[PDB]
Design a protein around this ligand. Sequence first.
Ligand SMILES: [Mg+2]
Ligand SMILES: [Mg+2]
Lengths: 341, 341
Amino acid sequence: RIVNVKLSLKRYEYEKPFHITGSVSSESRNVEVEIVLESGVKGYGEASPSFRVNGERVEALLAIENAVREMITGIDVRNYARIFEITDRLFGFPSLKAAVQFATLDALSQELGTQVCYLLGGKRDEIETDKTVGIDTVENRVKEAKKIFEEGFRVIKIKVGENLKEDIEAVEEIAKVTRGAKYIVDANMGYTQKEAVEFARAVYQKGIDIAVYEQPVRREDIEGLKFVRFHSPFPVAADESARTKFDVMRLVKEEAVDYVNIKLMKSGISDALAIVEIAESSGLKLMIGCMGESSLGINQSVHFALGTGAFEFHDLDSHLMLKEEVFRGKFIQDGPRMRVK
Amino acid sequence: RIVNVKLSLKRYEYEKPFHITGSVSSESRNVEVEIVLESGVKGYGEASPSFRVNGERVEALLAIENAVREMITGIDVRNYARIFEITDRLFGFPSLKAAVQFATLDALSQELGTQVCYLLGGKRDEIETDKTVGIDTVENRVKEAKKIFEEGFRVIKIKVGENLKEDIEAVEEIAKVTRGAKYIVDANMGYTQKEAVEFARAVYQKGIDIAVYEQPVRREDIEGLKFVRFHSPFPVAADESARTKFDVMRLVKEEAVDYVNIKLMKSGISDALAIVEIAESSGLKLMIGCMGESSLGINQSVHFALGTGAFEFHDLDSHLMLKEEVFRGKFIQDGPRMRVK
Ligand SMILES: [Mg+2]
Ligand SMILES: [Mg+2]
């Protein structure tokens, strides 16, 4: 049983400012979660709160430490479903919900003598992540893309959303110098429905293929997501629009998207598991993403992906963008490849 | 790693012939499944094939033992998701798919020093099952119902579907001698849409409440299930119409039913987990049922229900209707109650 829970502020600085539509980040402020069991076992998780997406603020997460402690201490991690249901009440603190739920599985797997990925199915032994090119001048974007390409990455995620004309140019210029790579374009809600369609058609006309076109429109515009899906050639994904299992059931019912970018930071383990099942029971396909997690945090998604093996693409590169002294993941990072120990 | 998979015929006779719409059974022929690991650990499952619902035949299941061995021998149970994906190909032998998948978890749980229910979440420590009153003369039905009530069962499942007039009479008579009990009425596809509605209204008019009204119409008549749901006062459940996770996604999209009676014999563990998540992500509610499983087979559903804790009602009484010399479930049967050891 859980005898204590501790929350701690952990700051990581980006190697370079990370610019996306409506947001520039120079630092990633996360909340580390440690769960202690009567047996002495300690489970760890990391919350990377998002004000833009989840409406969270790091100070707010740290402020409810006592409440979280009261909610879960006294429960046996072998009854993890009880912990999941309880933490589901933390829908206003989803990144914390995620960190606590994973810490629970982390502690449980240790007690059972296995790893989290195996507890979840042990589907895959290896996955590959893409790497992101933040918004910058076309010249700098091209430079970064070439660099990411030389590092061995074959899926390059390109941020766009603030300047349609320049975004088109940027994608076209990046494609020319990274022949052989697949591309994921993420607008982070920056385009109107029609601009989103025009962006896709312009790129398509140049003979470029986009593997996943992430959240082109505003989060509440479900009909807009569908409009883009039905009027442009590339698979459309919901990110900001897909936070809970309920959001996904609606997206599927409305036939709004081809993909859903699952993020533990938005859904927690509980909703992520539901979303994986919904996707496997429908025409929906999935990719797994991240926010500002460090290696300890990305580890949560690596085990989820390896265990479920439910993702077509993996955008788990936040830890590669942050400055960190010691690697704290429970997985092996081999270039773009991530493997189980 | 799996080194052996054994299938064997096990016959169990009913204490009394079991009569339901379009089917009378005096014997239950099951296929016991044993999976042996290199470590010596042995996992067990049981398939209770259904010609009527799944189109299966026991002889057919037994005939494919070599194929099953070739499909999963050599796979480590810690990669159970791989075994699940492979066995999902046995959609034509769903009861065997179920037995193999559970035996896999039974074996894995032992290697991890835990139980299947805990591997699935350990949500609950106890569940209660109803007991069924088969079709017979109103006099024999009321007699059996009274006997069941006296045994401590507070949820009584009543079979109907072959004679609306008598069915109504039967439910009305049973209700007066079992005050305090909840009732589940199961027509096993015997009624037309209008008859189904009339049945519910007739019973409703007498002040009788039906907790779950199971599959009133034919399996392909999804619109009919919806019609009954929208035109009669009681919760309507899909049983025969809900075999796979895809069937359920469709039922949810069509808003066809209030309930889905999940059976491992129809869905196997893989699809059952998907249906649980779909239900928890929608307005759908669930009950868990059975076919002709003996105690070893019912053990599979007891662990699934205890672990997920996703069911409002449990209809796991097939082993209570069969003559069995020795109890073989890895659970405690205490009257209507079933608990974890
Ligand atoms: Mg995104
Ligand atoms: Mg039924």
